[PDB]
Amino acid sequence: KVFERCELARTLKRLGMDGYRGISLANWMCLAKWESGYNTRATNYNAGDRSTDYGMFQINSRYWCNDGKTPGAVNACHLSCSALLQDNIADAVACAKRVVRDPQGIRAWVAWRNRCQNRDVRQYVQGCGV
């Protein structure tokens, strides 16, 4: 499913993402925008380490989810990567919360650092009444 801007904001907010670990809703929005364009079915294969990024937040199969075909995989989120390609993002959010619980925080995602960190990201939520 491809969420619309404010549809996503309102949802991420009811799922407790706004301010989660000091991370504002606009920052979670900015991450999703650049990682997948708000598309839950987004995927990206990484040839170097044979892993795949799944979903709206592009959660990697090597450490966070199990897809069954990645070498030396851990399943820190304890879920099938398959669950991260679903229309209902409740699982993707829970797993995104776990990722940012590690010391690196949201900086775990390179895209966020290159496109969101230290930049005005207010555009992502202005007009959503969130």
Side-chain angles (χ1 to χ4, degrees):
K1 168 188 183 177
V2 176
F3 279 78
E4 75 106 353
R5 192 166 71 73
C6 300
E7 173 184 42
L8 183 49
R10 297 191 280 259
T11 306
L12 291 183
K13 158 164 266 62
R14 63 175 169 265
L15 290 178
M17 290 287 256
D18 191 26
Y20 185 79
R21 216 110 307 200
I23 309 166
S24 56
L25 193 54
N27 271 292
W28 282 123
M29 288 300 283
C30 188
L31 173 71
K33 177 67 177 181
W34 291 92
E35 288 297 5
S36 61
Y38 302 156
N39 190 359
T40 63
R41 296 167 188 204
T43 58
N44 186 61
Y45 175 74
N46 301 301
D49 75 320
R50 261 124 274 198
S51 62
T52 297
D53 300 326
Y54 298 88
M56 181 167 72
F57 300 115
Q58 291 283 277
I59 298 183
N60 189 262
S61 61
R62 178 83 169 305
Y63 306 113
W64 312 104
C65 65
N66 177 35
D67 70 347
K69 58 167 173 295
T70 307
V74 188
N75 184 13
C77 280
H78 306 106
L79 41 52
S80 197
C81 297
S82 149
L84 306 177
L85 294 172
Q86 306 301 317
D87 294 350
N88 177 299
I89 62 176
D91 274 333
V93 167
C95 183
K97 286 185 179 168
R98 168 65 187 81
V99 177
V100 297
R101 257 177 262 144
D102 270 7
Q104 196 169 9
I106 191 154
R107 287 167 59 102
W109 287 275
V110 199
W112 180 84
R113 285 144 53 195
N114 294 332
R115 333 225 60 147
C116 309
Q117 184 177 69
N118 293 160
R119 245 155 299 235
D120 194 303
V121 297
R122 285 139 70 206
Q123 61 177 267
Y124 298 99
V125 289
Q126 305 298 288
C128 303
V130 293

